[PDB]
Design a protein around this ligand. Sequence first.
Ligand SMILES: O=C(O)[C@@H](Oc1cccc(C(F)(F)F)c1)c1ccc(Cl)cc1
Lengths: 252, 255
Amino acid sequence: ESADLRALAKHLYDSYIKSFPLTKAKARAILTGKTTDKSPFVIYDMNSLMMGEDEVAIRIFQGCQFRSVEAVQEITEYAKSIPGFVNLDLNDQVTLLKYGVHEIIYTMLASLMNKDGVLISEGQGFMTREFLKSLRKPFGDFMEPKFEFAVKFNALELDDSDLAIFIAVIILSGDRPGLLNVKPIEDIQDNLLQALELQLKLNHPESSQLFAKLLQKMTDLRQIVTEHVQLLQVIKKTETDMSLHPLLQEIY
Amino acid sequence: ESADLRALAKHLYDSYIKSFPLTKAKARAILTGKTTDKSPFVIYDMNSLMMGEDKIEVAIRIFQGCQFRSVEAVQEITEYAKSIPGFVNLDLNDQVTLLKYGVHEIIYTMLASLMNKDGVLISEGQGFMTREFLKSLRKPFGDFMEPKFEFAVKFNALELDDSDLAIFIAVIILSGDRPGLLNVKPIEDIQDNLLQALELQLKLNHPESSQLFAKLLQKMTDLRQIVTEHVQLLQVIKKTETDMSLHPLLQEIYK
Ligand SMILES: O=C(O)[C@@H](Oc1cccc(C(F)(F)F)c1)c1ccc(Cl)cc1
């Protein structure tokens, strides 16, 4: 009877694996687990940064939201793969992606983090956490709360099959402000929540109550997304430039 | 293994009954029509403040009352915590930061029971203050209760009764994702069990309400934001008015 739950599960797993080049399996088999393919370049301080492409803190935060925008296209193509999603009202598809993209970015940035730093480029760099903390004062405490979140989150040791379904759950919320038709949204989340329970039950047979521990991390995602959006304040009081980046501004 | 948690469910229900004099069941019989003796005196403007204070600045005297209700609630929350199995076997310092900010995440869960879309029970349930008398208040004060209402009406949609809430209240306390917690893991093995109790209890009490377990856990997000806002505006009310005094218990919970 619960066959579609196992089915939807690898439906989502397959889209996940198409939509996202760097899988968690791949990322962690490069970070901690001695990969071998070709150790990524490491950035530990101010001069290893200089000549990695081979001011500092501004262009590093910029670079981050450059990639955040690539990500959104990856996530948007995923959402559209979730059964029921495109059949929603089209405004609602947009409200769901608008309000849920940050949460998914920070869930998946966990996959590329360990306690000592984060994979850069796509697994071809690694920027140490200790270097990031030694950035200027607007930027020295931005990436820190995400590491703090990641180590907790990875302790759950989910893989990509788990994350595939979890990501779909975040999108199909039902409490985003400005939704015109919540029921098809909440009825889909229901089927997703149920496939995720199953998946966690059989892929993590003796990690009891992982479902519950995972749902309550959605609490800490939103605190993170909140404090992140609030940090975007510096933008107003920064070394705001002159005309050299117009188009780019509204690109972001 | 099943009646494990139903004996745990039972246990907590009892303490809850013993610890909190105004349950949801009682409050829901007052806010409706189950009354000839239980009907509240309704306050909605300021000469309902008036004669209202026979049947035992205004915006201030109300706020303090609300802040004093919270003290009572801290006291009863603490008594209920001690009954949660294993809770009292934890590091003295840990217990204190388990019942720190969690005291408010719970207060607003139980405030929801005294609320409908149009107001909140007051004084023993004797009273009932409307949402709009509150919103229509002064300086920052007219801001305070409104988001509790927003949460209260969407929370109350879940249709939880006391037996459900008892366990969920427990799960809130025994979290273990709180600043200062020396020895975490014993906390989240306790909580691990509560969630088992909650899971079984919800499926059994609300068999038709699928994924209520999931919907309910999610609401903890809304709770933290509610405390955030409350704490937040509870800094302004300290510059605008340096005359109001804050209760000793509320005093050091607030950091
Ligand atoms: O009537 C009450 O129970 C309290 O006054 C209140 C007045 C308005 C709102 C509230 C609250 F329940 F929303 F917090 C309490 C109250 C409690 C104790 C003393 Cl001493 C004074 C006022």
